[PDB]
Amino acid sequence: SHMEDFVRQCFNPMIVELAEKAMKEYGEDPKIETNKFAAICTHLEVCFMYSDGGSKHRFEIIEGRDRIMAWTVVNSICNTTGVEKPKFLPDLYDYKENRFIEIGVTRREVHIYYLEKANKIKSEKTHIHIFSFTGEEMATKADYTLDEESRARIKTRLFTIRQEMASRSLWDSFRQSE
Ligand SMILES: O=C1NCCc2cccc(c2)OC/C=C/COc2cccc(c2)-c2nc1c(O)c(=O)[nH]2
Ligand SMILES: [Mn+2]
Ligand SMILES: [Mn+2]
């Protein structure tokens, strides 16, 4: 499906297997839903870079775990720190700022995606951080959590994936897909 071969050669093999394992958990096959396959791989890579931008063990990685296991660590964090349980599964937990982080990668307007995720999670205690393929970012209360250098690499990698999709003529089908 062309997009499938590009995903396997663009993303780290463990990230590709994680997106496959996550898609098959929700009854989706990455061989047909190739645009969703590239989006989950991109979201998985950004989340792993985000947690890497911290300090040693600043973040608790929620994304990439099984649906049952991810909710298990979420319950453990809520029952040890005391934060409110979120209605939807977040991506990380900031042990420094004591809040869950929700990371999104957009292809449309970066200003729009926040409006979608803000009106979804009623628990306003959890943070929200959107990255864009054009190099923009938007976080809750202007608290961008990470250092400027850590976020700049995520934007750079996001634009690199954009150029590779357009170079093989799949960016338009992937951008006009969410
Ligand atoms: O937490 C998340 N978990 C996604 C795990 C998953 C895998 C397959 C199917 C799913 C769930 O069913 C629910 C979603 C179905 C639409 O597939 C896409 C496509 C592109 C991005 C995302 C989801 C996306 N997933 C999350 C985010 O937090 C996020 O910001 N974006
Ligand atoms: Mn998630
Ligand atoms: Mn997310």
Q: What is the DSSP annotation of 112-139?
A: HHHHHHHTT---TTSEEEEEETTS-EEE
Alpha-carbon gap, residue 43 to 72, rounded angstroms: 21
Select from 98, 109, 76 the least CA-distant residue to 143.
98
Task: Give, using CA atoms, the residue closest to atom 14 of ligand 1.
Answer: 26
Residue 29 known to be catalytic: no
Residues sharing a CB contact under 8 Å with residue 95, sequence separation 6 or more, in sequence order:
57, 58, 59, 60
CB burial string 85-100: b at 16+ within 10 A, e below: ebeeebbbbbeeeebb
Task: Please report, for the chain, the start and end positions of each structural domain, with discontinuous segments joined by +.
Answer: 1-178
Q: Report the run of H or E that residue 103 belongs to, with start and end.
A: strand 99-106
89: helix, strand or coil? coil
Report which ligand 1 atom has the smallest distance to the Cα of 102: 28
Report which ligand 1 atom has the smallest distance to the Cα of 23: 8
Alpha-carbon gap, residue 142 to 132, rounded angstroms: 16
Residues sharing a CB contact under 8 Å with residue 175, sequence separation 6 or more, in sequence order:
107, 108, 133
Q: How many CB atoms lie under 10 A from the CB of residue 109?
A: 14
Which structural technique was applied? X-ray
Alpha-carbon gap, residue 104 to 114, rounded angstroms: 8
Alpha-carbon gap, residue 92 to 145, rounded angstroms: 12
93: helix, strand or coil? strand
